[PDB]
Amino acid sequence: VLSEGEWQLVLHVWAKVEADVAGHGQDILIRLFKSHPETLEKFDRFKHLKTEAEMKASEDLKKAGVTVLTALGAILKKKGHHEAELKPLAQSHATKHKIPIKYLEFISEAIIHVLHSRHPGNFGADAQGAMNKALELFRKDIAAKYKELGYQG
Ligand code: HEM
Numbered sequence: 799v800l801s802e803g804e805w806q807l808v809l810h811v812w813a814k815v816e817a818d819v820a821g822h823g824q825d826i827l828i829r830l831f832k833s834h835p836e837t838l839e840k841f842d843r844f845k846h847l848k849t850e851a852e853m854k855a856s857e858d859l860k861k862a863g864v865t866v867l868t869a870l871g872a873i874l875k876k877k878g879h880h881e882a883e884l885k886p887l888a889q890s891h892a893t894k895h896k897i898p899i900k901y902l903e904f905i906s907e908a909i910i911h912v913l914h915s916r917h918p919g920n921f922g923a924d925a926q927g928a929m930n931k932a933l934e935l936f937r938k939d940i941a942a943k944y945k946e947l948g949y950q951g
Pocket of ligand 1: 837838840841842865866869870886887890891895897901902905
């Protein structure tokens with residue numbers, strides 16, 4: 799369970815992401831795909847992309863970036879009271895998309911990497927610790943829901 803102080807560090811760096819969610823989502827997905835190429839296979843619409851240039855030019859990858867960060871943003875803003883937001887998400891990612899928790903760990907890593915690079919103003923060690931806490935919470939609660947749904951994760 800995060801403190802209010804920890805939530806405010808999360809939400810301060812989020813506020814910067816929101817200046818340009820599409821740009822941040824491009825960087826974050828590209829980092830994910832570069833770091834764990836196996837994750838790209840889950841995206842039938844753009845899993846053929848071969849290079850970072852291709853990725854940066856893909857309108858479909860850009861939309862996905864906006865989707866993930868907007869959904870995550872809405873979750874973070876709930877400050878742990880995210881049961882409603884996680885229901886649909888766990889169901890789709892468990893049952894349709896088939897995303898293991900380890901891939902949720904991979905995108906969490908990419909999120910932290912990009913924020914650390916982009917936002918040294920709002921992503922010092924304390925803020926990064928708070929964001930890691932929030933993302934662990936997210937992954938813990940998703941994992942519990944996956945189990946409920948019958949998915950090993
Ligand atoms: C912070 C983590 C994540 C959040 C908040 C998130 C949220 C979403 C949302 C809102 C959608 C669209 C609605 C839906 O289908 O449920 C979506 C679709 C999808 N997500 Fe995620 N997601 C996350 C992580 C992942 C990861 C790590 C992968 C794969 C490695 C993944 C694969 C997909 C796929 C394949 C789709 C369908 C996209 C499409 O067909 O257009 N997601 N995700």
